[PDB]
Design a protein around this nucleic acid. Sequence first.
RNA 1: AAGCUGAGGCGAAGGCGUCUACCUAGAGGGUUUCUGUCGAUCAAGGGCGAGAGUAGGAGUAUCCAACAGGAUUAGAGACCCUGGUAGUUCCUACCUUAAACGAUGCCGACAGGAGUUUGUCAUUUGUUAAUGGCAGAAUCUUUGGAGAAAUCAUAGUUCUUGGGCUCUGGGGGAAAUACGACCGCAAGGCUGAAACUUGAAGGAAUUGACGGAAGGGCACACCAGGGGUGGAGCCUGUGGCUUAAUUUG
Lengths: 135, 219, 24, 61, 82, 100
Amino acid sequence: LGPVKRDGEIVMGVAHIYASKNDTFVHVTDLSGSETLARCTGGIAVRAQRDEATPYAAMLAAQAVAARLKELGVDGVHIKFRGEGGSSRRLPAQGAQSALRALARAGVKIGRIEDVTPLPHDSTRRKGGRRGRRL
Amino acid sequence: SFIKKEWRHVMPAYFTGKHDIGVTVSNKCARGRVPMDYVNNRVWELSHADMVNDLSHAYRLFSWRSIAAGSEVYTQFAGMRLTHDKLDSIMRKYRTLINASVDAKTADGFILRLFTVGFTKKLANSHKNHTYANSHKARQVRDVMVKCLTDACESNGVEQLCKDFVDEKIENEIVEKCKQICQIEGVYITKVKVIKAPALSNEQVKVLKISKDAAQLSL
Amino acid sequence: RAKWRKKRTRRLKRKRRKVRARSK
Amino acid sequence: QVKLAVVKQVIGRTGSRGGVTQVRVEFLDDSNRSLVRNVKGAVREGDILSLLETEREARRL
Amino acid sequence: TTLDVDILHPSVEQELHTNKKKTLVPNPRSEFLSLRCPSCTGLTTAFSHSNVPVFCKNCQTPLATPTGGRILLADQVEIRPR
Amino acid sequence: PVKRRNHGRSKMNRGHTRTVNCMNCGRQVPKDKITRFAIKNMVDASSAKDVSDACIYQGYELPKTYQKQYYCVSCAVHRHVVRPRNVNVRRNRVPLFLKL
RNA sequence: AAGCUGAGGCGAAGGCGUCUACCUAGAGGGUUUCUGUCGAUCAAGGGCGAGAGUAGGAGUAUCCAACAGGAUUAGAGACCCUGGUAGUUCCUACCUUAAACGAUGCCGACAGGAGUUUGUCAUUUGUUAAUGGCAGAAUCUUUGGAGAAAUCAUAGUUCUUGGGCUCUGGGGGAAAUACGACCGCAAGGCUGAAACUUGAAGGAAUUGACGGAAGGGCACACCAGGGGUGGAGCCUGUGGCUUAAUUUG
């Protein structure tokens, strides 16, 4: 129970797919900023830690949200892609594009996909150092 | 679990409408309080394409602060941006990129900071791969970008501005002048951040088509 | 590594300095 | 529950030890779509494969 | 033709193409132009390169104006060879 | 001896240059010394036809991500962005693509 | 101070990237301005000099020598992970070293083509361009000469040996040392031996072999499987122990 729909109207929301190595987030919310059901690979998504970020486990979490959305029930959610933060400069993982596609074939209506990765303008030092990571 | 949270419609045209945009959900007003003691300056973020159902100008983005209401939330110009896809696409190598940040007051009671990005162009007779504008001929353009943008902003009120950002009127008035010096291909107006918004007066309620239900509450 | 050998002598010298002043 | 593909074209072979094929398939359910799935054994074009899960394509090529 | 070049008596092209100093006799590429604004009828001498912006006696506006090289002839103005 | 006239550095006329980072090592390297401008599709390819059923707004253009990539020699070789090659074709300063 | 950002520009080198106003220096070009050899190079002597480091204030977001845990390993004082103070930033004094590298001292002349490119001028309406001039910055080449070779339009014009100045090296260690001095708050810098010791230490390139280097191929090499061996008793071969001999490969 929620929308109190007018009759022949469409209700829209947001996705916020934060895709980063080690985890995936499908934290859907209203445009204003009131959070609806979220979920993620780590929580209800799986187990292990091995397979948090892997694109099956993102695909499982993105059905678990869209179970609820029809129920709430929204309709379609705008998708914004967040990769990772500024110092690292990392763009979204593979687990994004499986999470998006599970919402489509759930199925939930969509539109306006954006990359909202916080990139810096120069700014700060990375981890590691001069030589950086060497493994 | 979720029950008892009161959903409300969202609503100034301006450029288009299709006045209703979306439904935003907060919470029940529990006495001792107004509806406006929730929905406190929430921003929203919408393309031009959402209301007119048209491609073209799909990339441009608009934003509105939650200025007033309780029965139904009414809203006010927060600013503009591009989609990050579009802004990224414009940049090219082997060309002189040109910027111009302008602090500019409107005819009405906003204060704005506008931005822009403009590139040089090769054309016809030049065979070389890279054309670079001179420091002087780049600084000539920044004067043209400021002067056109600051004058066109200053003269007109803010509904005309927000129409002209869709119509790309100010874009074309720049390339007029540049033909004389540097051709400059590209030219987009990127951002306009609202620094100092007008406070909610009863004259502004009469302008923006905000109902009697709102100004009873939030004043 | 020559760098290190250099570091070792720097150290070696600083010790002979110490011992010597023991006796100024 | 127990859906039925059929092999349009064998693109090639894969795995570390060359153990498995992978194949373009068009669903026999008739909903339509093409899925790129890794099969185990040996596959002649036009063969029918039963998939517990219709979702997820394999990885890359 | 690296080996044979005739350098005592070169072409009229090649003297103009080579540098001011590099010619067989060194001498400059710059002369005193006569000038006239169509307003006046007074015929004014000037140095083509200049440094100083040129006026006639009568008017007020400079006849020629200074750049790096040759003088920049402002307005419709003309040259009588003398 | 000198392997390259360049010395692996593309800088002439200047004593100093800025540093960047390979995306993988995170290593600090001068800018002068393995960049790629990289356009990938944001959805995918096989995902895209499943999406365009469920799209609000008809037709639409599904956007592309852009990324300027900086590596470093150690990182570049491991990923097969660059490899070593024969002493004669080291000089070859054009990329693989070729046109008429 | 991303992207623009390049074998692009400026600066004596170290080095220098948002925009605005402010004070300041100069290279290159043009010049029928002026002076008239005022110059080249340099022991001493004088300044500038990455990053680290030091002293005293002002900061302290990020990252982080040390340090503390966690993993891995035989051990791990490390590589990987989570935290972390000194430092990293500004101001006033210091220190004076780097693969401070074009590992190529400075000024001067001449010797070959080719097209790039930065600044600026010249003759043209090919005017954000064409051809040519000086000054930069690189490049290419079936060119000449040089070099041990790699290679180099300078590393050419050198037994066909001499344009002018300065500094350095004289087999390898011992020795970025010792002693003595000067400079330094200190860390150190700078100048710089001998006893003794040794037959090589090095440079470039070729042929192999090798790589937990890359790319091509292959086979019971694995994959999928089938049947065994390793356990039990016995037959035989070999090591051990035994013996006069347990003949021997």
